Design a protein around this ligand. Sequence first.
Ligand SMILES: C=Cc1cccnc1
Ligand SMILES: C=Cc1cccnc1
Lengths: 306, 306
Amino acid sequence: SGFRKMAFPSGKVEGCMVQVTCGTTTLNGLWLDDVVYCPRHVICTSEDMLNPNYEDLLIRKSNHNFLVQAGNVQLRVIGHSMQNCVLKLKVDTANPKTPKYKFVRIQPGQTFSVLACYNGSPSGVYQCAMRPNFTIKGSFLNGSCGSVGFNIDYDCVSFCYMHHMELPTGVHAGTDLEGNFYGPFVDRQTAQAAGTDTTITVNVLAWLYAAVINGDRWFLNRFTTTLNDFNLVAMKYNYEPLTQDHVDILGPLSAQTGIAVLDMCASLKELLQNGMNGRTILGSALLEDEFTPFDVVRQCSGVTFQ
Amino acid sequence: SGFRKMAFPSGKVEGCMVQVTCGTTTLNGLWLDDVVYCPRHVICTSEDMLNPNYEDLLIRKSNHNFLVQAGNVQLRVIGHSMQNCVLKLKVDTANPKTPKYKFVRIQPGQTFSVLACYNGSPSGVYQCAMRPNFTIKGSFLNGSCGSVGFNIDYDCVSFCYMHHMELPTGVHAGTDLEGNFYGPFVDRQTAQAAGTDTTITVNVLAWLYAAVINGDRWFLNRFTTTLNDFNLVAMKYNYEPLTQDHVDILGPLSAQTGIAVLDMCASLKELLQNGMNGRTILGSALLEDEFTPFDVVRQCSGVTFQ
Ligand SMILES: C=Cc1cccnc1
Ligand SMILES: C=Cc1cccnc1
């Protein structure tokens, strides 16, 4: 037992991380086969950074303007191209550590592991979720641009996130690996802000099941509710609607615990309307919404990855 | 910015994990150079498991009783020996992925990353602390025996933990890599229990600094207190004493935030005596004690590892 915000083993990604320097800017790149992926604002200098015309900036660049370091080994850039908000730097060396991978865009509410990096060098790994407002509450300092987020499914790394910027509330915004930003953010200096967020309702339910599986039952009740009546309480508490599909995805956990999903909704409703009254759940005094149904089944079962 | 329970990149450890089978028992081993380290209760069967005489059990074993799988590659056991509560299985193959390592025993209060494993196959990574009662609040299922805990310091993996058992409250007990258990636990089936715990006071302070660095300041105050007066409040709230050395280790964070350590103690005291009154700190509604001063400086700075 136990329940921890658990990331995927990061080894397969660590051997893809490289350092991309261009001008005065150094950031992290993702080296897969003979291409390094990185944020396109590497070609900007501090005064480009305002309202840049990236297609103009890139024609003025040479291959040799791109210093790529794979550890202490220099990579020779033989080509460069722009795909949305990422650069694709073509190197003369395929990454022999290239894992099986995909470029997948995730949904708000889904989680992923983040291998935070500085100067192409991995620093830590931690689990995040894509907030309903398409931000992520990460832990990122200057130099972490180009750190990626990923899931791993057996041996395949599904890359889903490239880090690009911090927003003024301290949350983080970036792209999928195809260079398309998550949410209404841009790689310029504007007064952009996160925008209002919600709590991921299906994930709180999944985490309530995680609790029941792990022995916290004080919040259960005989009561039940309809899906409609639950959703009127969710809207009050800035929770995002629960759909029948969410109830369906919660079936396995309902099944394993013997707690009908709508019964669990009744419990959440009471938790939302009454607070916790000085008690905790899985060592938390808040309702946790960054574990998916997948994550709960993953730790409460024992699935691994080769 | 941001603050996340952050583990070390796990790649260097993942390439040491192997599967040790012996009889009906399968668990994880740690392969470094030509030796696999694993818990000695692998040589037990379900009825040995009560009060075993492990030295008797091991003389009855043959080298060939030990199936060692490094992925899909079998390792030939050429020798076996017992060091306290671990087995040392000598294999004919040095692990070519052996990182620079040390075997270090940690102190209660210090943290480490845990690469949870099943059948020698890494499942997830997460950060833990050694509780004052020498347990750890991990996330471990059947088959996770032999998963290790570690820190990484530049390129060197300091291994500190081998997982051995779950205790009836769901917390976890194990050994250092020299086979010596953390705390008064034994690798038998007894009615052993965790024993009373405390909150790691120095770590809460470090995390309060993490908050101030990240913009949460609502809990600060003009007040101050003496170290003695603080420790009388700590004892009330089951916090463990703060020493001058703890204050000394907190200097850098005091220095960077401009908040004297004893001023921060005053804040903790008010937080202990008043609660949080519906507010949160670093997204937590509880006082967090599983970040050391090192961990805070590590994320709030940007140290990495090669
Ligand atoms: C302001 C620090 C920062 C954080 C993430 C990305 N870029 C910069
Ligand atoms: C009871 C499950 C378990 C957890 C950790 C280690 N061993 C067994």
